[PDB]
Every structure is written in structure tokens, then in C-alpha cells.
């Protein structure tokens, strides 16, 4: 099975350099974009940038460009994220993720992150987002909708994806291209988009649905993905 293998946890002091890695296995490594995503402790997902390993084409979020370096070694099927000088504020979990669209297949290309690495935690110490409600809750069976509000440059002109993240684990693609479900995602999950807003509906909650949910869309002005702040879903009981 396809996987992205990330390097182990790091504990560093402010000022030190660090390079972390993400090795792609069981697919054609040169032919898919790989994204890096930051999650500060207790916070949401942030798009850092992405690289196309075939030619090392790198596209950064303006929030991260000049602060980190993304690179790739085709021969070892590995992508990297590197800092020359860490700050305490760099403490976070870093995920790599494959963009699952097939660029060569002749169909219009949509951005979505289909396979995620397990994350690498980095602890450094010396001793714009889409709008989502921060929480949702219901008893088992409760119909719950989670909203995502954006603007013309993202949701208005681009497709929306949804990711589910159970604490301590990697996000999982739930809905892509507004309303399409990957195999394995149950039919109680559905997505819709209208104007500059999008919605994830859970027709009736199950206990295993307790998780954080993130919407995401490409922003044409920023030339990268933008995540919503996340909705923590509690199932009451």
C-alpha cells in the first residue's frame, strides 16, 4: 500500500538547524506533488508549501516562504523540510501529504491530499484561514452540519476538500472535489458547496466520528491551499 514515511520526533534548542524527511513508497514518486503541513500544539492545520519531485518545482505559502526550505531527492524517493535556525515557535507536528490527482491522465486537475504521513513532532525549547465553527456536538443519530466560509479567491472559484483527524494521528481525506467520497468513507458523510461557502453533513453521528474536521480549498491569490480553523466534533452520551 502507498505510504509516506516520515522521520522520527525531534527535540532541539532555539538556533539549531533541522532537516526532516518524507519518503514516498509504492507509487511513482516523481509524478505527484507533495505538500508540507504544520500543526502547532492544540491548533489547526496550516499549508506550508509543496514540491513536485520530478523537477523540484517548489511552491510556498507566503506565510512560510523564506522561513523554511522544501527540497527533494528523486533517487531516494524522499522530500525534505529544513530550517537553518529554529525558533521555539517552530514547535509543532509536521505532516507531509501526497496530492492525489493524476496530472498525466488527461482529466482536469483538482488539488486534494489523499495519502498522509504519520507526522513528525518537533519540540524547540530551552527549559488567513477559512472560517469554521470551532465546535460541533450531538448525541448518536444527531444530524450535524459543519460550515466553511471563504471568499471568491478560494471556495468561490475552487473545489473544497474535507479532512478528518483523530487526535495524535494523521488527517484522513473525507470528501474531495466538493462532494466526492473516497472508498472507505461511509455514506453518512456528504459535502456541498455554494457560492463562497461549503458544508460537511453527517446524516447521523456515530461515536467513532469524534474528531477534528478541517475544510480546505486552493486559493488562487495565494497559490496554495488554505485550511479552515477546524471543528472539534463531540459525540455526547
Numbering used by the authors: 1 to 127, 143 to 252
Provide excerpts from the study:
A type I hypersensitivity response is initiated when allergen-specific IgE bound to high-affinity IgE receptors (FcεRI) on the surface of effector cells, such as mast cells and basophils, are cross-linked by allergen. The major birch pollen allergen, Bet v 1, is one of the most potent, and therefore also the most studied, tree allergens in Europe 19. We present four novel Bet v 1-specific IgE, for one of which we solve the structure, all with their genetic origin in the IGHV5 germline gene, and demonstrate that they target two non-overlapping epitopes on the surface of Bet v 1, thereby fulfilling the basic criteria for FcεRI cross-linkage.
The crystal structure of the M0418 scFv was determined to 1.3Å resolution. The structures of the two independent molecules of the asymmetric unit were similar and were superposed with an RMSD value of 0.56Å over 232 Cα atoms. The most significant difference between the two molecules was disorder of a stretch of residues from CDRH3 of molecule B (residues 110-112.3), while that from molecule A was completely modelled. In molecule A, CDRH3 extends ˜8Å above the surface of the scFv. The order/disorder observed for CDRH3 in the two molecules can be attributed to differences in crystal packing. Thus, in the absence of stabilizing contacts, CDRH3 is mobile. Two glycine residues immediately precede the CDRH3 loop, at positions 108 and 109, and presumably contribute to its flexibility. Nevertheless, the structure of the unbound IgE scFv M0418 demonstrates that a human allergen-specific antigen binding site may display a protruding CDRH3, similar to human antibodies of other isotypes 60–62. The more narrowly defined epitope of IgE-derived clones M0418 and B14 (residues I56 to K65) encompasses the loop connecting β-strands 3 and 4 of Bet v 1, and belongs to a conformationally flexible region of the allergen 49. Notably, the critical importance of residue F62 in this interaction explains the inability of M0418 to bind Bet v 1.0112, an isoform that carries a single modification (F62L) in relation to Bet v 1.0101.
